[PDB]
């Protein structure tokens, strides 16, 4: 059984301290420039959901990684210059609802499956 565990798909970019006024919607809006809708993780308090200021975006594409990292590195959002670093993290299923809620918005695109019918 091979799922491609040697292939780091759980790779993503790390965004640094953002404005507390910035929400996941704003974050997705910024990445909408590249038109690549994939996983997005915003560090929010487990009780009140306070924006901790750390953002992550997991998209699968080696070309787009280096592109977005260099392109967004130094880009200002609300006065906050985006510092993009490389990092990898495996989403635990104990928090699947979070990532699922993310794909809930992406489902509008995910509906289009590969291979058109028979």
């Amino acid at each position: 059984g091979a799922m491609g565990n040697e292939y780091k798909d759980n790779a993503y970019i790390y965004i640094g301290n953002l404005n507390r006024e910035l929400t996941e919607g704003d974050i997705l809006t910024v990445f909408s420039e590249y038109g690549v809708p994939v996983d997005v993780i915003l560090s929010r308090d487990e009780n009140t959901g306070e924006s901790q200021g750390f953002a992550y975006l997991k998209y699968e594409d080696q070309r787009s990684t280096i592109l977005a990292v260099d392109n967004l590195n130094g880009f200002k959002i609300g006065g906050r210059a985006l510092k993009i670093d490389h990092t990898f993290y495996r989403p635990k299923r104990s928090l699947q609802k979070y990532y699922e809620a993310v794909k809930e918005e992406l489902d509008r695109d995910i509906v289009s499956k590969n291979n058109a019918e028979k």
């Binding site: 996941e24 919607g25 009780n47 959901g49 609300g78 809620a101």
Partner: peptide, 23 residues
């Protein structure tokens, strides 16, 4: 801490518009 021991976080896609004033 009865209401501080729960863990529930639901992504909220809202538009602040903070970046609108510079884009």
């Amino acid at each position: 801490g009865s209401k501080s021991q729960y863990i529930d976080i639901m992504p909220d896609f809202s538009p602040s518009g903070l970046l609108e004033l510079e884009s």
